[PDB]
């Protein structure tokens, strides 16, 4: 795209752009300007006039440097902020369909890490390039007078290399787009790895994920190596061509000296102007590289942005009528998911409801009830149907007004990482704490909210990870109530709610059911006992209908179901000791590179000396041709050396960066679950941290490091040529060097300080946005997108200003340093005039030293341009090094310990007292004791949030026990090798996590370190009562499951997880609420399958069905960390304990 990074000017941006361009023009063209005056060289009088001219040019140089840097960087910051804001606004704008079809996992790394370069390369370097252009131009103008004839020759080289830059730019643009796509894929893989890090650490599947990340990284490294070798070879060949054109012009001048067309002075001035143009191109060399990278990233970003979605999330066209009744109309609604447009989910179903009438939808698993609820939500438009509310077409009314006039409760709701206060406030724009308290009371959330510390300040973990399932469901119910809408959409609202809790919630909802057009769905007949209208589900059709009495008399699906129920400075380099010889070759190439920089002056002096040595013109021409040949040979060696140097730097840097990213992933996986629990160490937080750290580390360690080393060798050899030639003059130029070096320390310190905090704010924005994308479904449900955008805008407020400040600081520093160098050059000229009057040193030697310092001058300035990159890289490398250095409490990769191959299947917990890292103030464990023998299917029961999941997690060794001892067959869990057991046992989490992979792939994840057999997968799926449905599904087992299994109905996911656990065939199984939401027939099938393999594998069972726990060998009660009763199901049944009370309710 042309101006791909600009789509709005206004007076403001238009004037900013104009002024930046004009000021840079003065800068670039100003470079060959002071050069012309130098070439133009009573002798003392002219020396003073020229030195004063040099001082004036230097003062203007400071002025222009600051003006351009600052103004163009201010405009660039405005543009970058506008780009990010528009990107996020559109990202929210898109319809659900694009998110479903596309793998949103990339955006998290692409939203941040790329956006960085999108503006970075498209701003900082840009002014330079602009200025450089004028330079060449003015430099050519310099030669226009300096032997106009010879000047036309170089003119030919201008486009000869000009078109070359454009071509290399486009090629690198394609290469960078490919690299970015690969990087986005790697980031999506890492993000998905992070979010379910729990399960991944559970199954010990670390190796496979690590290999996947290394694979994406290797592909990216190959793409980068191609691009970087290309760019370095481009530099080398360009250098060779510049030297060749110079040699041709040298032969031309040799001819012209005898030709009499021009004097030697004019030709030398033309040669100086040509070398100035050479410096301009060398400056633009990297300026064209960033231009291209940014062009590719901007193409991609705006292409993602430009999409206008059909279900617009902001349009106000839709009507929002005042008088609305609780009447809905569904007719001939036939629709299918866009993840798989073939499968028909809606078979032309039709429904009806009335305000205050609660319509219950009960059917078979996968009936599409969640689909019906989402369709009501208008999240996706139906394929065919006239779904309308209160007569008016759903598409007719305003989308925002409708969505705000609706509430929904998800089957497995996800809680953002805030405090319950903020989560609830998300329910409505304006909520009174009186409303909050009323809602919490309605949802039974007051009990736990009060009991735990931070009553409303309790910051919930990611996705509500820090609270047990019951609490999350209560909080979600409270959120929905807080919405206080005219049409509620509770769906499977009771999943783990305690019988007392479930009854209380249902009674409260009914108490307020009068005004609400709710649509209840639930698997417990108690919840649908009072359902006003009960409808069955059968292949996308509704048959059984009417009152519960009507269905019971019909002996329909409802009747059958009812009956069935019955710091970093050099350590970063130190780590890269593997690249020792690539670095060595780079160093040798750069060494000669530097010497060459100021060596050009020695060549010019020798050329003049040959021209003025002998009067005879035959010998003169012979010597001139010999000099031209020597220059061409040196140019060939130089082209070779520069490309070898560039290749060495690029390859070593890419190797280092890939190694760093891979090792960081290895450690991040090797860290502890608690470290993930760390809010600062969040999922999106971890991903963005990794991406930005690696990106900055390379961006310093990349070709820029090579250019800085070359400038250091260049300016270095420059000052060196002065010492040999001049004495008592270059000493001044060098004694001043440290003065400018002092301004660099200040700049570096200030930039590092600014960057730490600005990057912290950027990472905060990244975690916020990552959560926004990952739970985009809930956000759509709550229509809280605008608040998300505002929070992101505020996040952007910090480093927007921070970068404005850093741009001002860098501009001032650069302008002051350049002007100081120009003042030093004018002063060296003045010292030379004084010395000439003293007549102690050769005037031509002074000319050579002045020219050599001018040659090193471009090098010095550009190295001045490495300050903020170097600081950012130091900071990023510090963070990465620290992250790698950590060795966790339980190290996954550390195999030291034992290995009880003779597993006796004997579990014993004694005085097990333990608390959560986020719930240390919340005593979760009190030292309860339990014992399980071989094939003992122990079941634990207790009140909501009785820590039940905590016993399972602790058995996971996810967290060691504050007090007590958990052994295994008479062996402490700590003593044995953790990996042996972690693979050995299997568990089924209460809200299981999938991976956006084939169902076959997910299941195969059930066992790792062993190739899964399609026969084994078939057997497990059959055992799970999901083989039939999966076969009914197209793509058999290769079906690509949505994000976190976002495409399979809840029973589907739970059955798949159970199959995964059974596949592991472990001696110890853990079923946390194993029938969270499944058909009673499905529950029976699962229980029968589990029983059929009961013997030989000890089991722990958790669920909220009396029948499910009835078969449990020994039931265990939970009472505030105390086991009140422990015995048979019949023992508790005979006893009038709380088990019996709950069973009754
Ligand atoms: N996002 C999706 N993309 C594609 N197919 C989907 C998606 N969500 C669900 N499906 C398919 O549609 C079937 C029915 O949809 P849905 O999950 O809404 O039904 P349900 O009756 O609420 O489910 P259940 O009671 O099993 O949880 C699911 O079993 C799955 O096969
Ligand atoms: N990650 C966590 N960090 C801190 N505290 C936690 C965490 N997970 C759970 N807790 C605390 O421990 C309690 C017990 O939750 P857990 O899921 O372990 O048991 P549970 O009672 O079986 O769950 P449920 O509420 O689904 O019945 C939670 O209610 C909460 O107070
Ligand atoms: Mg469902
Ligand atoms: Mg639980």
Mapping DSSP onto H, E and C, the string for 326-349 reads: CCEEEEEEECCCHHHCCCCCCCCE
1044 alpha carbon to ligand 1 midpoint, in Å? Answer: 14
Choice from 95, 100, 337 to test ligand 1 binding pocket (greatest atom count within 8 A of CB): 337
Question: How many Å apart are CA 130 and CA 20, to the nearest integer?
Answer: 9
Does residue 32 have its Cβ closer than 6 Å to ligand 1?
no
Closest CA to 850 of 141, 281, 50: 50
The answer to the question of whether 944 is labelled as a binding residue is yes
Which distant-in-sequence residues (6+ apart) come within 8 Å of 701 by Cβ? 572, 653, 656, 657, 873
Question: Beta strands 406-409 and 487-490: pairing type?
Answer: parallel
Cβ burial of 913 (10 Å; 0-12, 13-18, 19+) is: middle
Give me the helices (H) in 969-1070, please: 978-984, 999-1004, 1014-1023, 1027-1032, 1050-1064
Cβ burial of 561 (10 Å; 0-12, 13-18, 19+) is: buried
Instruction: Report which ligand 2 atom has the smallest distance to the Cα of 1102.
Output: 22
Question: Beta strands 533-535 and 487-490: pairing type?
Answer: unpaired
Which distant-in-sequence residues (6+ apart) come within 8 Å of 733 by Cβ? 719, 722, 824, 825, 828, 853
- Tokens found for residue 380: 């996706």
CB 346 within 8 A of CB 375: yes
CB 900 within 8 A of CB 591: no
For tokens 């023992």, name the residue. 1131
DSSP string, 1072-1108: TTTTSS--HHHHHHHHHHHHHT-TTSEEEE--S-HHH
Question: How many Å apart are CA 984 and CA 239, to the nearest integer?
Answer: 63
At the fourth CATH level, the homologous superfamily of domain 907-1144 is P-loop containing nucleotide triphosphate hydrolases (3.40.50.300)
The answer to the question of whether 388 is labelled as a binding residue is no
Question: How many Å apart are CA 66 and CA 55, to the nearest integer?
Answer: 17
Which distant-in-sequence residues (6+ apart) come within 8 Å of 705 by Cβ? 649, 653
CB 361 within 8 A of CB 561: no
Question: How many Å apart are CA 296 and CA 302, to the nearest integer?
Answer: 10
Choice from 490, 1049, 1053, 1075 to test ligand 1 binding pocket (greatest atom count within 8 A of CB): 1049
CB 517 within 8 A of CB 326: yes
Question: How many Å apart are CA 300 and CA 119, to the nearest integer?
Answer: 13
Closest CA to 872 of 1018, 1073, 744, 693: 693
Question: How many Å apart are CA 594 and CA 589, to the nearest integer?
Answer: 9
Question: How many Å apart are CA 846 and CA 830, to the nearest integer?
Answer: 11
- Tokens found for residue 611: 């021209």
Torsion of CA 636, 640, 645, 650, to 10 degrees: 130
Question: How many Å apart are CA 624 and CA 259, to the nearest integer?
Answer: 14
Question: How many Å apart are CA 445 and CA 448, to the nearest integer?
Answer: 6
The full length of the chain comes to 1145
713 alpha carbon to ligand 1 midpoint, in Å? Answer: 66
3-state secondary structure 661-725: HHHHHHHHHHCCHHHHHCCCCCHHHHHHHHHHHHHHHHHHHCHHHHHHHHHHHHHHHHHHHHHHH
Q: Is 419 helix (H, G, I), strand (E, B) or coil?
A: strand
Task: Identify the residues whose C-beta falls under 6 Å from ligand 2.
Answer: 461, 465-471, 496, 916, 918-919, 922, 924, 944-950, 990
- Tokens found for residue 397: 């009314």
Which distant-in-sequence residues (6+ apart) come within 8 Å of 476 by Cβ? 409, 410, 413, 415
Question: How many Å apart are CA 253 and CA 249, to the nearest integer?
Answer: 6
Closest CA to 235 of 663, 593, 575: 593
Give me the helices (H) in 485-579, please: 499-511, 548-554, 557-565, 571-575
User: What DSSP designation does 891 have?
Assistant: -
Question: How many Å apart are CA 925 and CA 910, to the nearest integer?
Answer: 12
930 alpha carbon to ligand 4 midpoint, in Å? Answer: 18
Closest CA to 1077 of 1100, 1054, 1107, 1061: 1054
Q: Please report how many Cα atoms fall inside a 13 Å half-sphere around the Cα of residue 1137, on the Cβ side.
A: 22
The answer to the question of whether 703 is labelled as a binding residue is no
- Tokens found for residue 677: 């629990």
Does residue 1052 have its Cβ closer than 6 Å to ligand 1?
yes
Contacts 24+ apart (CB under 8 A), 33-38: 33/57, 33/138, 34/58, 34/61, 34/822, 34/825, 35/139, 35/142, 35/272, 35/273, 35/276, 35/854, 36/138, 36/142, 36/269, 36/273, 38/272, 38/850, 38/851, 38/854
Q: How far is CA 392 from the centre of its chain?
A: 43
Which distant-in-sequence residues (6+ apart) come within 8 Å of 51 by Cβ? 826, 827, 829, 830, 833
Backbone angles phi, psi at 911, to 5 degrees: 55, 35
Q: Where in the chain is the domain with CATH 1.20.1560.10?
A: 10-310+585-885
Question: How many Å apart are CA 924 and CA 941, to the nearest integer?
Answer: 15
DSSP string, 125-147: HHHHHHHHHHHHHHHHHHHHHTT
The answer to the question of whether 369 is labelled as a binding residue is yes
Torsion of CA 660, 661, 667, 668, to 10 degrees: 150
User: What DSSP designation does 1037 have?
Assistant: T
1023 alpha carbon to ligand 3 midpoint, in Å? Answer: 22
Does residue 1047 have its Cβ closer than 6 Å to ligand 1?
yes
Question: How many Å apart are CA 1070 and CA 1061, to the nearest integer?
Answer: 9
Instruction: Report which ligand 1 atom has the smallest distance to the Cα of 491.
Output: 22
Find the helix or strand (DSSP H, E) in which 762 lies: helix 730-774
Does residue 339 have its Cβ closer than 6 Å to ligand 1?
yes
Question: How many Å apart are CA 684 and CA 667, to the nearest integer?
Answer: 17
CB 281 within 8 A of CB 135: no
CATH class of domain segment(s) 10-310+585-885 = mainly alpha
- Tokens found for residue 577: 């000791």
- Tokens found for residue 578: 């593997």
Question: How many Å apart are CA 379 and CA 782, to the nearest integer?
Answer: 12
CB 657 within 8 A of CB 183: no
The answer to the question of whether 364 is labelled as a binding residue is yes
- Helix, strand, coil in percent for the chain, rounding step 5: 65, 5, 30
For tokens 């800068």, name the residue. 27
The answer to the question of whether 1111 is labelled as a binding residue is no
Question: How many Å apart are CA 1039 and CA 1030, to the nearest integer?
Answer: 9
Closest CA to 565 of 599, 611, 529: 529
Instruction: Report which ligand 1 atom has the smallest distance to the Cα of 365.
Output: 26
Question: How many Å apart are CA 288 and CA 169, to the nearest integer?
Answer: 6
Question: How many Å apart are CA 332 and CA 479, to the nearest integer?
Answer: 33
CB 353 within 8 A of CB 327: yes
Question: How many Å apart are CA 782 and CA 483, to the nearest integer?
Answer: 9
Question: How many Å apart are CA 518 and CA 526, to the nearest integer?
Answer: 17
Q: How far is CA 138 from the centre of its chain?
A: 44
The residue nearest atom 22 of ligand 2, judged by CA position, is 948
For tokens 């529950």, name the residue. 1083
Task: Determine the Cα angle at 968 with ends 966 and 969, to 5°.
Answer: 140
The answer to the question of whether 370 is labelled as a binding residue is yes
Question: How many Å apart are CA 492 and CA 474, to the nearest integer?
Answer: 12
The answer to the question of whether 718 is labelled as a binding residue is no
Which distant-in-sequence residues (6+ apart) come within 8 Å of 1015 by Cβ? none
Q: How does 599-617 read in b/e, with b if 16+ C-beta sit within 10 Å?
A: bbbbbbbebbebbeeeeee
Find the helix or strand (DSSP H, E) in which 940 lies: strand 937-940
Question: How many Å apart are CA 573 and CA 579, to the nearest integer?
Answer: 9
Task: Determine the Cα angle at 530 with ends 526 and 534, to 5°.
Answer: 95
Q: After which residue numbers is the chain interrupted with C–N beyond 2.5 angstroms? A: 41, 566
The answer to the question of whether 73 is labelled as a binding residue is no
Question: How many Å apart are CA 443 and CA 425, to the nearest integer?
Answer: 15
- For residue 347, which ligand has an atom nearest its CA? 1
Strand partners, 319: 397
Question: How many Å apart are CA 737 and CA 62, to the nearest integer?
Answer: 17
Question: Beta strands 328-333 and 349-353: pairing type?
Answer: antiparallel
CB 299 within 8 A of CB 114: no
Does residue 1051 have its Cβ closer than 6 Å to ligand 1?
yes
Find the helix or strand (DSSP H, E) in which 868 lies: helix 867-885
Question: Beta strands 349-353 and 1098-1101: pairing type?
Answer: unpaired
Question: How many Å apart are CA 360 and CA 526, to the nearest integer?
Answer: 12
The residue nearest atom 3 of ligand 1, judged by CA position, is 1047
Give me the helices (H) in 887-957, please: 948-955
Separation of first and last alpha carbons in the chain? 67
411 alpha carbon to ligand 3 midpoint, in Å? Answer: 6
3-state secondary structure 443-493: CCCHHHHHHCCCCCCCECCHHHCCCCHHHHHHHHHHHHHHHCCCEEEECCC
369 alpha carbon to ligand 3 midpoint, in Å? Answer: 6
- What Å distances lie between residue 961 and 591, 916, 1093, CA to CA? 60, 10, 31
Closest CA to 374 of 339, 425, 342, 420: 339
Rg over CA atoms, the chain: 37
Question: Beta strands 937-940 and 907-913: pairing type?
Answer: unpaired
Strand partners, 592: none
The residue nearest atom 19 of ligand 1, judged by CA position, is 368
Find the helix or strand (DSSP H, E) in which 793 lies: helix 785-838
Backbone angles phi, psi at 1071, to 5 degrees: -115, 95
Question: How many Å apart are CA 165 and CA 145, to the nearest integer?
Answer: 27
The answer to the question of whether 368 is labelled as a binding residue is yes
Q: Please report how many Cα atoms fall inside a 13 Å half-sphere around the Cα of residue 651, on the Cβ side.
A: 18
Cβ burial of 784 (10 Å; 0-12, 13-18, 19+) is: buried
468 alpha carbon to ligand 4 midpoint, in Å? Answer: 6
Choice from 947, 1073, 1076 to test ligand 2 binding pocket (greatest atom count within 8 A of CB): 947
Q: How far is CA 893 from the centre of its chain?
A: 26
Q: Please report how many Cα atoms fall inside a 13 Å half-sphere around the Cα of residue 443, on the Cβ side.
A: 28
Question: How many Å apart are CA 1056 and CA 1042, to the nearest integer?
Answer: 14
3-state secondary structure 1010-1035: CCCCHHHHHHHHHHCCCHHHHHHCCC
Closest CA to 1061 of 1101, 1034, 1030: 1101
Question: How many Å apart are CA 450 and CA 440, to the nearest integer?
Answer: 10
Instruction: Report which ligand 1 atom has the smallest distance to the Cα of 368.
Output: 19
Strand partners, 785: none
Instruction: Report which ligand 2 atom has the smallest distance to the Cα of 948.
Output: 22
488 alpha carbon to ligand 2 midpoint, in Å? Answer: 28
CB 301 within 8 A of CB 315: no
Question: How many Å apart are CA 151 and CA 338, to the nearest integer?
Answer: 65
CB 911 within 8 A of CB 927: yes
Task: Determine the Cα angle at 340 with ends 335 and 345, to 5°.
Answer: 30
Q: Where in the chain is the domain with CATH 3.40.50.300?
A: 907-1144
Instruction: Report which ligand 2 atom has the smallest distance to the Cα of 1073.
Output: 26
Strand partners, 409: 490
Which distant-in-sequence residues (6+ apart) come within 8 Å of 205 by Cβ? 1005, 1008
For tokens 């060098």, name the residue. 734
Question: How many Å apart are CA 877 and CA 159, to the nearest integer?
Answer: 41
- Tokens found for residue 765: 């924005």
Question: How many Å apart are CA 860 and CA 852, to the nearest integer?
Answer: 12
Which distant-in-sequence residues (6+ apart) come within 8 Å of 816 by Cβ? 62, 66, 743
Question: How many Å apart are CA 11 and CA 22, to the nearest integer?
Answer: 16
Strand order across the 907-913 sheet? 928-932, 907-913, 963-968
User: What DSSP designation does 1137 have?
Assistant: S
Question: How many Å apart are CA 434 and CA 440, to the nearest integer?
Answer: 10
Q: How far is CA 217 from the centre of its chain?
A: 15
1080 alpha carbon to ligand 4 midpoint, in Å? Answer: 20
Strand partners, 201: none
Task: Report resolution in angstroms.
Answer: 4.4
C-alpha dihedral sign at 393, 395, 396, 402: positive
CB 721 within 8 A of CB 598: yes
Closest CA to 714 of 275, 68, 220: 275
Instruction: Report which ligand 2 atom has the smallest distance to the Cα of 677.
Output: 1
Instruction: Report which ligand 1 atom has the smallest distance to the Cα of 1046.
Output: 1
The residue nearest atom 17 of ligand 2, judged by CA position, is 468
Question: How many Å apart are CA 388 and CA 396, to the nearest integer?
Answer: 9
The answer to the question of whether 699 is labelled as a binding residue is no
Which distant-in-sequence residues (6+ apart) come within 8 Å of 375 by Cβ? 333, 335, 346, 382, 387
The residue nearest atom 30 of ligand 1, judged by CA position, is 1048
Does residue 127 have its Cβ closer than 6 Å to ligand 1?
no
């Amino acid at each position: 795209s042309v101006f791909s990074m600009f789509r709005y000017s206004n007076w403001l941006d238009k004037l900013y752009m104009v002024v930046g361009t004009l000021a840079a023009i003065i800068h670039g063209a100003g470079l060959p300007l002071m050069m012309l005056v130098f070439g133009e060289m009573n002798l003392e009088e002219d020396m003073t006039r020229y030195a004063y001219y040099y001082s004036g040019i230097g003062a203007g140089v400071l002025v222009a440097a600051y003006i351009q840097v600052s103004f163009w960087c201010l405009a660039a910051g405005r543009q970058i902020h506008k780009i990010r804001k528009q990107f996020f606004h559109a990202i929210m704008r898109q319809e659900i369909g694009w998110f479903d079809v596309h793998d949103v996992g990339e955006l998290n790394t692409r939203l941040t890490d790329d956006v960085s370069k999108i503006n970075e390369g498209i701003g900082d370097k840009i002014g330079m390039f602009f200025q450089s252009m004028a330079t060449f131009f003015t430099g050519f103008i310099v030669g226009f007078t300096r032997g106009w004839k010879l000047t036309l020759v170089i003119l030919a080289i201008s486009p000869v290399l000009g078109l070359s830059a454009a071509v290399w730019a486009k090629i690198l643009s394609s290469f960078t787009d490919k690299e970015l796509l690969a990087y986005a894929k790697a980031g999506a893989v890492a993000e998905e790895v992070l979010a379910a890090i729990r399960t991944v650490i559970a199954f010990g599947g670390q190796k496979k994920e690590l290999e996947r990340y290394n694979k994406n990284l290797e592909e990216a490294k190959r793409i980068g190596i191609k691009k970087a070798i290309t760019a370095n070879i481009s530099i080398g060949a360009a250098f060779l061509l510049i030297y060749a054109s110079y040699a041709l012009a040298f032969w031309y001048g040799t001819t012209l000296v005898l030709s009499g067309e021009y004097s030697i002075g004019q030709v030398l001035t033309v040669f100086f102007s040509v070398l100035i143009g050479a410096f301009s191109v060398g400056q633009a060399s990297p300026s064209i590289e960033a231009f291209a990278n940014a062009r590719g990233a901007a193409y991609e970003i705006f292409k993602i942005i430009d999409n206008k979605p059909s279900i617009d999330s902001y349009s106000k066209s839709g009507h929002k009528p005042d008088n609305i009744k609780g009447n809905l109309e569904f007719r001939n609604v036939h629709f299918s998911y866009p993840s798989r447009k073939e499968v028909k989910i809606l078979k032309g179903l039709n429904l009806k409801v009335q305000s205050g009438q609660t319509v219950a939808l009960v059917g078979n698993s996968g009936c599409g009830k969640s689909t019906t609820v989402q369709l009501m939500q208008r999240l996706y438009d139906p394929t065919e149907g006239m779904v309308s509310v209160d007569g008016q077409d759903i598409r007719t009314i305003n989308v925002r007004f409708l969505r705000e006039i609706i509430g929904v409760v998800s089957q497995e709701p996800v809680l953002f990482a805030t405090t319950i206060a903020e989560n609830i406030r998300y329910g409505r724009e304006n909520v009174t704490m009186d409303e909050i308290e009323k809602a919490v009371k309605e949802a039974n959330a007051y009990d736990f909210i009060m009991k735990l510390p931070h009553k409303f300040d309790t910051l919930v973990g990611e996705r509500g990870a820090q609270l047990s399932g019951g609490q999350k469901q209560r909080i979600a119910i409270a959120r929905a109530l807080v919405r206080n809408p005219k049409i509620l959409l509770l769906d499977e609202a009771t999943s783990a709610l305690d019988t007392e809790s479930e009854a209380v919630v249902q009674v409260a909802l009914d108490k307020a059911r009068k005004g609400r057009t709710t649509i209840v769905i639930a698997h417990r007949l108690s919840t649908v006992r009072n359902a006003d209208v009960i409808a069955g589900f059968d292949d996308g059709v509704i048959v059984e209908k009417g009152n519960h009495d009507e269905l019971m008399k019909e002996k329909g699906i409802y009747f059958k179901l009812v009956t069935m129920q019955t710091v970093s400075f050099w350590r970063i380099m130190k780590l890269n000791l593997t690249e020792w010889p690539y670095f060595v070759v780079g160093v040798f190439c750069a060494i000669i590179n530097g010497g060459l920089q100021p060596a050009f002056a020695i060549i010019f002096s020798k050329i003049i000396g040959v021209f003025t040595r002998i009067d005879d013109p035959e010998t003169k021409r012979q010597n001139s041709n010999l000099f031209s040949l020597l220059f061409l040979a040196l140019g060939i060696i130089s082209f070779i050396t520069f490309f070898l140097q560039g290749f060495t730097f690029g390859k070593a840097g890419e190797i280092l960066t890939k190694r760093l990213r891979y090792m960081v992933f290895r450690s991040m996986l090797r860290q502890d679950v608690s470290w993930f629990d760390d809010p600062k160490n969040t999922t999106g937080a971890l991903t963005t941290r990794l991406a930005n750290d690696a990106a900055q580390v390379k961006g310093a360690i990349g070709s820029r490091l090579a250019v800085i080393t070359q400038n250091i060798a260049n300016l270095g050899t420059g000052i060196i040529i002065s010492f040999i030639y001049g004495w008592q003059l270059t000493l001044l130029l060098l004694a001043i060097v440290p003065i400018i070096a002092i301004a660099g320390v200040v700049e570096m310190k200030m930039l590092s300080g600014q960057a730490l905090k600005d990057k912290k704010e950027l990472e905060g924005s990244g975690k916020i946005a990552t959560e926004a994308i990952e739970n985009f479904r809930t956000v759509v449900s709550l229509t809280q997108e605008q608040k998300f955008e505002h929070m992101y805008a505020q996040s952007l407020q910090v480093p927007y200003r921070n970068s404005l400040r850093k741009a001002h600081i860098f501009g001032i520093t650069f302008s002051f340093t350049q002007a100081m160098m120009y003042f030093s050059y004018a002063g060296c000229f003045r010292f030379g005039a004084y010395l000439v009057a003293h007549k102690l040193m050769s005037f031509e030697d002074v000319l050579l030293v002045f020219s050599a310092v001018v040659f090193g001058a471009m090098a010095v300035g550009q190295v001045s341009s490495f300050a903020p990159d170097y600081a950012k890289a130091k900071i990023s490398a510090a963070h990465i090094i620290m992250i790698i250095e950590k060795t966790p409490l339980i190290d996954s990769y550390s195999t030291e310990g034992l290995m009880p191959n003779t597993l006796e299947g004997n579990v014993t917990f004694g005085e097990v007292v333990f608390n959560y890292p986020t719930r240390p103030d919340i005593p979760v464990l009190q030292g309860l004791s339990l014992e399980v023998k071989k094939g003992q299917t122990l079941a634990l029961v207790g009140s909501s949030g009785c820590g039940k999941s905590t016993v399972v997690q602790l058995l996971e060794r996810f967290y060691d026990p504050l007090a007590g001892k958990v052994l295994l067959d008479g062996k402490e869990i700590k003593r044995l090798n953790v990996q042996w057991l972690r693979a050995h046992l299997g568990i089924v989490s209460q809200e299981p996590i999938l991976f956006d992979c084939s169902i076959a792939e997910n299941i195969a994840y059930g066992d790792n370190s062993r190739v899964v057999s399609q026969e084994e997968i078939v057997r497990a799926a059959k055992e799970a009562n999901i083989h039939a449905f999966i076969e009914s599904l197209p793509n058999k087992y290769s079906t690509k499951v949505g994000d976190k299994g976002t495409q399979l109905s809840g029973g589907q996911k739970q059955r798949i997880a159970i199959a995964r656990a059974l596949v592991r065939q472990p001696h110890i199984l853990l079923l946390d609420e194993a029938t969270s939401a499944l058909d009673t027939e499905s529950e029976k099938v699962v229980q029968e399958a589990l029983d059929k393999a009961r013997e030989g594998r000890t089991c722990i069972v958790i669920a909220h069905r009396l029948s499910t726990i009835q078969n449990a060998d020994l039931i265990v009660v939970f009472q505030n960390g105390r086991v009140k009763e422990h015995g048979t199901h019949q023992q508790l049944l005979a006893q009038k304990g709380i088990y019996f009370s709950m069973v009754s309710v």
